[PDB]
Amino acid sequence: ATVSAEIPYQIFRDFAENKGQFTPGTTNISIYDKQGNLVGKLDKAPMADFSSATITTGSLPPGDHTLYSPQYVVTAKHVSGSDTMSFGYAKNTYTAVGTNNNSGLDIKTRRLSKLVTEVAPAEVSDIGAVSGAYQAGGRFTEFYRLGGGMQYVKDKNGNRTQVYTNGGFLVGGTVSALNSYNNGQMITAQTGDIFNPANGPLANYLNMGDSGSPLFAYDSLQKKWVLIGVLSSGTNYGNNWVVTTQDFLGQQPQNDFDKTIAYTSGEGVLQWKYDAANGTGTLTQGNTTWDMHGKKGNDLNAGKNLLFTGNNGEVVLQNSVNQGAGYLQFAGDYRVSALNGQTWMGGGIITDKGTHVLWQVNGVAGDNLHKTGEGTLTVNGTGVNAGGLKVGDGTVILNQQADADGKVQAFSSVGIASGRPTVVLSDSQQVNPDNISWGYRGGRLELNGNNLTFTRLQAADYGAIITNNSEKKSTVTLDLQTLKASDINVPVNTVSIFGGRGAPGDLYYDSSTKQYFILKASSYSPFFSDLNNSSVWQNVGKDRNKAIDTVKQQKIEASSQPYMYHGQLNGNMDVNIPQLSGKDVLALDGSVNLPEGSITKKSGTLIFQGHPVIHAGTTTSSSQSDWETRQFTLEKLKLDAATFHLSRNGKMQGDINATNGSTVILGSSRVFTDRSDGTGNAVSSVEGSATATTVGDQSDYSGNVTLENKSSLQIMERFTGGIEAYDSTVSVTSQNAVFDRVGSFVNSSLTLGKGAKLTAQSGIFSTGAVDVKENASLTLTGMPSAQKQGYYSPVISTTEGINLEDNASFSVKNMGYLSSDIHAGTTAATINLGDSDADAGKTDSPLFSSLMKGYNAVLRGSITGAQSTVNMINALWYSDGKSEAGALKAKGSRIELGDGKHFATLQVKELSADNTTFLMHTNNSRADQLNVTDKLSGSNNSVLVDFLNKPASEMSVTLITAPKGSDEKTFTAGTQQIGFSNVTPVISTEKTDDATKWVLTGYQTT
DSSP: OEEESSSOHHHHHHHHHTOTTOOTTOOOEEEEOSSSOEEEEEOSSOOOOOTTBOSBBTTBOTTSOEEEETTEEEEOTTOOSOSEEESSSTTSEEEEEEEEEOSSSSOEEEEESSOOOSSOOOOBOSSOSOTTTTSTTSSEEEEEEEEOSOOEEEOTTOOEEEOOOTTOOOEEEEOOOOEEETTTTEEEEOOSOTTOGGGOTTBOBOOTTOTTOEEEEEETTTTEEEEEEEEEEEOSSOEEEEEOOHHHHTHHHHHTBOSOEEOOSSSOOEEEEEETTTTEEEEEETTEEEEEEOOBTTBGGGOOBEEEESSSEEEEEOSOEEOTTOEEEESSOEEEEESSSOBEESSEEEEOTTOEEEEEOBOOTTOEEEEESSSEEEEOOBSBOOSEEEEOSSEEEEOOBOOSSSOOBSOSEEEEOSSOOEEEESSTTSSOGGGEEEOTTOEEEEOTTOOEEESOOEEOSTTEEEEOOSSSOEEEEEOOOSSOGGGOOOOEEEOOSSOEEOOTTOEEEETTTTEEEEEOSSEEOSTTSSTTOSSSEEEEOSSHHHHHHHHHHHHHHHTOOOEEEOSEEESSEEEEEOOOSSSOEEEEOSOEEOSSOEEEEESSEEEEOOEEOOOTTOOOOTTOSOEEOEEEEEEEEEEESOEEEEOTTEEEEEEEEEESSOEEEETOOEEEEETTTTTTSOOOEEEEEOOOOSTTSSOEEEEEEEEESSOEEEEOSEEEEEEEEESOEEEEOOSSEEEEEEEEEETOEEEEOTTOEEEESSOEEESSOEEEOTTOEEEEOOOOOSSSTTBOOOEEEEESOEEEOTTOEEEEOSSEEEEOOEEOTTSOOEEEESOOSSSOOBOOSTHHHHTSTTSSEEEOSOEEEEEEEEEEESOEEEOOSOEEEEEEEEESOEEEOOOSSSOOEEEEEEEEEESOEEEEEEOSSOBOEEEEEEEEEOOOEEEEEEESSOOOSSOOEEEEEEETTOOTTSEEEOOEEETTEEEEEEEEEEOOSSEEEEEEEEEEEO
16 A cells, blocks of 8 residues: 555556556556656556455455455455445445354455345466465466555655545555465565565555455466455565465355255256244255255344256245345256245345246345346246346346236346346336436346336446347437426425524415415514515415426426436437426437437437546546547437537537527537546536547547528538538538538538638539638538549539638639639639649549549639639639639639620739630620730640631631730630531730730631
8 A cells, every 4th residue: 555656646546446547458558657757567467357356345444355256255354343345336335244264364254145246256266375376487477456555655765655545545556476485375575665676567565454455466377367365464575465265265155055956857846945933944856855044033144055956947935035145046047936926035146157047036125136147037027026136247137927907017126237237128117217227337228129218317337238139129218307396295384473494495375465485595584574575585476386386396497407328328229308307408428329220309408428537536527638439329310409519539420410490519618527427326417618639539420410490500520421401500610521421501501610621522502602711721522432542533513602701712623513603802812723732633434524524623603803813723614704813823724714605704913824725705706805914924825716606707806915025925726626627716916005915817727
C-alpha cells in the first residue's frame, strides 16, 4: 500500500479496480512519470481480472477476502471483524456463515450464504507449496497485487507520505518474484525497495490493513492468471504471503457437500422428503437412500451442498425446503418439480457446462435464487413466484406457466451481472420489466420476439444488453417516468386556526372559504395570519380533482431529471420513445446495433454520445479528455417534432427521418454525465457541454437524412451521406462534410457556414439556391469508383442559383456537371472549373465523350462576379447568359459564349487563356462578344463561329475586344465541320486608339 510518488497515484487505483486503461486483457500498457517519462511496460502478461477480490468488506478494509469458489472466500487467519462483504459494487453484499482455520498456517477460508453472481471466482494455482517454485526465471513471469490497507507514497529519497483516503480504497501494483520458506508453505519478496526494478514498474509495499490481500501470478505454461497467496505479515524490507494451495482451500467446500446423488436411469423418480424442524431430509430412489441437510434454527451453515449426477434425472419435492447456505449443483440434465406447491430456497443452483435443468419449484418471498454455472436453467413453475432471481452465469429461460386462475409470475425481480449470463423471455408475462436489473458488468436480456414496456432502465454499466435474436421483431417501448402518478399520495389536510407543522408541497383545505392551497414552507402562522400571503401558500383551483393533479404534476416535475441509459440496444428490435414525463430528454452513452431495427422519438430531446472513461474514486465530467467511442448502428431513426444530438465520440451509421419541425444536430456540444456512473446507484443526470479537440474523438455520421415540414439539420463534424430536404433547412459548418448519396433540396435552403467545406460526390438538386458563406469551399464531383482508385463517374447537378460570398470558393472538377448560374456580386469569390492538380481524376465511363465532351468539368450557368476570379483547367463552360468576372485564367479549356438565338456577353478585366477555345454565334450582323478591359495574355487560342443563317460573303461583326496593344495572334479561327464539308470563319484584326479587336468578315469552304 506504499507506492512510488513519481507515478500518478490514479494509476495505482485504476490498476486496482480494473478501470481506465487497465481493463482485463489489455496488453503492453506503458507506465509514465508524473512528468511524462517512461517508467516501464506491463508487457510480461495481459491485464488480470481483480474482481474476485472484495470491493468492500464492511468494517474491514477492502481486498481482505478473495473469491476462489462460487460460495467460498480466502483470507489470512488473523483477519476478523466483519461478516458482510461485497463483490463488484459496494451494494452487492454477501454474508459469511462459517469459517475453516488452517491449524498450522495463517490462512483460512470462509463460506458465504449464497453464490456470488457478480464476479467470477479466482483460479487457484495447481502447484501448491513447492519450495522455490515461485522464484524468478521459473514458471511464473509476472506478479500482481491488490489490497486496501493503509495507503502511503514514497519518493526516491525515502520520504514517505500518507494518502488521504477519505474512507479507504483499493490500491494495486506489481511485486518481485518470491522465495520460499517454512518448507515451501509461505513465500516472501523484498518489496520494501519500491525503486528496485525487480519489483516491477508499479512496485507495492504492503502495510497494516493489507492483511489477507490476494497475490496473483501469471502461469506462463498454462497461460492464465492464478491466485498464489494471501498476505500474512511484513517487515522493514519485504512482505510474506501464505501460499494458497488447492489442497486446503478445497477442504471447506468438500466438507460441506453431502454424498453425491447418482441418478440410476432405470429406477424410480428421486423422492425428496425433508423435516424442516431440525433441518434433516432424505432423497430415496429404489433401495438407495441419500442424506441431505438444510437450515437448522438460525444456523445457515448447517445446510450442506448437493451434487446431482446422471442423465435425464427426475426429482420430486415432497416438502418445502430451506437449505440455508447449501446449494444444488447439477452435473447432468435434470427435471425438478414440486408436489403440492412446495418451495425451495438456499445457497443457489449451479448448472455445469453442457447441462440443462428444468426447474419447476417456486421460491420464497424475500429470497433471491442465485443461479450460476455455464449450463442452462429453464424455470417452468406454475402460478406466481413471490421471490427473486439473481443470475451470474449461463442461461436462464423464463417459462412460467399460468395459474389455474390465470395469475403468472416467474420472479418478483431479476438481476443480471458479471457479463456472463443470458436471460430469455418466453412470453411477456414473465417479469415486470421495471423489476429487471443489470448489475456489475451486466449481461444479456433476450426478448425472444416479445414486446416489453419500461418506465425505468435499471442498467448499471455498458454490460447491460437488450437483444432479440428471434425472427419475430421485438418492439421495446421506453415510456420512462421518474415519478409515476399512480405512486403519488396526496392527503387532503386541513388549515388549523392556531399553528401548523408540515412539509412543503402538501395539500391543505380551508374549511371556511373552502379553497385548496399548496404549502410552500415548513410552517404556517396561526390565526390565518399567512393565508393571504403569497410566499408560504400557493393557490390552486377550487375543484378537488383539479388541485390534486396540480400537486401530482409539481411532484413529478420537481422529481424529474433527464434520463440516461448506459446499456446496449442490439438485435432485431424496434425502440419507441414517446414524450417522457418531466424533463423530456434521453441520452444514450452505450451501444446500439439494430441492422434492420428502428428507433423512434416523439417530442423532446434524444442524444447519442460517447462514454467518458470512468476512473476509480472519481466521478465522470463532461470536461474530461479521455472518452470511449460508442457505435450507434441503425437502419432508420425516426424523429417526430424532437431534437437529436450526435455528440462527441459517437459514431453513427443509419438513416435519419425528421418531420414536424424536428432539429437534427450532428456534432453537438450537449452531452450528459452520470454522477453515480460506475457505482451501481441510480442515475444522476448532469447536463454539460463537451467539444472534442482531435479527430477520431469527433462525432462521425454515415447515412441518408430526410427532412420534412420545417425541420432543421446542422452538420458540424464529419459527415458522409445524403439529404432529402422538403420544406426544411440544412446548415453546414463542418470542415470535412461529404455528400455520399444524392443531395435533394425541394423548397429547402442549403447553407455552408463560414469556414465550412462540403464536397458532393453524387450531385445536388435544389429548386432554390445554395448559399456559400465567407471562407467556405463547395465542391462538386462525380461518384468516385469503388474498384479503381482515382477514377470518377460523371454526375449531373441541377440548381436554381449558387451564391458565393466574399472569400468563398466553389469548384466543379473530376467528372462534375452543373446546370446552375453563379452569383458573387461585388465580393471576391473564386470559381474553379476542372482540377488544378496533376494526376487529376480519370474515368472509364463512356459519358466522358458523350456528356463531359472530353473535359474534366462542365458548367451551364453564367458567372456574375465583377470582383471574382474564375479558374478553368481542361474545363467546359456554357455561358447561357451575360457573364461578368474580375479575372479568367483558362488553360486548355473551352467557353461557349452565347445561348440559342439570343446573344450574350463575357466581360473580364483580366484574361489569361492558354490553348483555350471560344465559340460564338452570329446572325451575320450581331454576335456574342468577349470583352477584355484591363489586361489580356496567353497564346494559341482558337475561336469558332456558329452561323445561324447562311454565312455572308462579307460582314463586319466584332467578336472580341482586348486592351490596346494586345497580341493579335492570341485568337485564331478554327475549322468546324458543317454539312459534309468544312466551314471556317475568317477573323480580321483591327488595331484602334482605344482597343484591339477581332472582327469576323467571311468564311472558307472545302
